[PDB]
Amino acid sequence: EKFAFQAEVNRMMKLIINSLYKNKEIFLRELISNASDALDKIRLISLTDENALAGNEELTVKIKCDKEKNLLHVTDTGVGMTREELVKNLGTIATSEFLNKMTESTSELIGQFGVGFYSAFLVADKVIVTSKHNNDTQHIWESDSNEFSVIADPRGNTLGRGTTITLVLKEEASDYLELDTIKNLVKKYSQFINFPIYVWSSKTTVWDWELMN
Ligand SMILES: COC(=O)c1c(O)cc(O)c(Cl)c1CCc1nccn1Cc1ccc(Br)cc1
């Protein structure tokens, strides 16, 4: 259940963390970007499988703040990941030219190599990935960066299909819990995205999904 990061991933996480120290906001750009990709992947799959979207009729990104529990949730209803995929796609990488371009901006570089997930550790002490893939049951990937574990989700299939990224925010990254801030940041980083992105918001005092693009 417990796993070690591959060396290159450790180096990569460091390079990422040690080059975007200034513009931390990028983590949210990249998570929204990967969320879109997940939906693309499942839409494509839906072209040749009418049963592809059975676990969830919708194709969205839902973002939820939990100021109280110090958590930020980003949930796509994309393709999701199987257990094996969690262990492989988040624990290794398929690359070393990337690690040399990185040393010699660099926010555009991680975006290009599709490896911006790890930027989440810029604002989080622990990162949790809850994922339901059509071919598998719901599993959970957790890491504080020093290792990771993948477990079967005891709650069963709550996602229907897809992925929630959950960030336990750092002391200094509390700013990103304010609904003001996240609405603002998603507005910015979600224009080019063509799936709907909602933020769970407060209107006059009620709560519902609010569309941001
Ligand atoms: C898009 O794949 C995912 O399931 C997914 C998601 O739905 C939301 C996310 O925030 C993230 Cl990070 C992912 C995984 C995408 C990812 N980032 C780094 C590695 N990976 C796995 C991966 C990379 C390339 C391909 Br092609 C497939 C999976």
Author numbering: 74 to 167, 171 to 180, 187 to 286, 329 to 337
Task: Kindly provide excerpts from the paper associated with this entry.
Grp94, the ER resident member of the Hsp90 family of molecular chaperones, stabilizes mutant myocilin. Compared to WT myocilin, which is secreted from TM cells, mutant myocilin variants are sequestered within the ER, where it forms a non-productive interaction with Grp94 that precludes clearance and leads to toxic accumulation. Specifically, the nucleotide binding pocket within the Grp94 N-terminal domain differs from other Hsp90 isoforms by an insertion of five amino acids. Thus, Grp94 harbors a unique, largely hydrophobic, pocket that can be exploited in inhibitor design.
X-ray crystallography was used to determine interactions between 4-Br-BnIm and the Grp94 N-terminal ATP-binding site. The crystal structure of the N-terminal domain of Grp94 in complex with 4-Br-BnIm, reveals a binding pose in which the resorcinol ring is anchored into the ATP binding pocket via direct and water-mediated hydrogen bonding interactions with Asp149. Additional interactions included an apparent electrostatic pairing between Asn107 and the chloride-substituent of the resorcinol ring. Electron density is not readily visible for the brominated benzene substituent of 4-Br-BnIm and the adjacent Grp94 loop (residues 165–170) that caps the ATP binding pocket, suggesting that several conformations of 4-Br-BnIm may be present. The structure of the N-terminal domain of Grp94 in complex with 4-Br-BnIm revealed a pose in which the bromo-benzyl moiety was not locked in a single conformation. Thus, we infer that this region of the inhibitor is sampling multiple binding modes, including the novel hydrophobic pocket targeted in the structure-guided approach. 4-Br-BnIm represents one of several small molecule Grp94-selective inhibitors under development to overcome the liabilities associated with pan- Hsp90 inhibition. Mechanistically, inhibition of nucleotide binding domain of Grp94 inhibits the apparently irreversible binding of mutant myocilin, enabling degradation via autophagy instead of continually failing at ERAD15. Here, we demonstrate, for the first time in vivo, that a Grp94-selective small molecule, 4-Br-BnIm, cleared mutant myocilin, leading to a reduction in glaucomatous phenotypes of IOP and rescued RGC dysfunction.
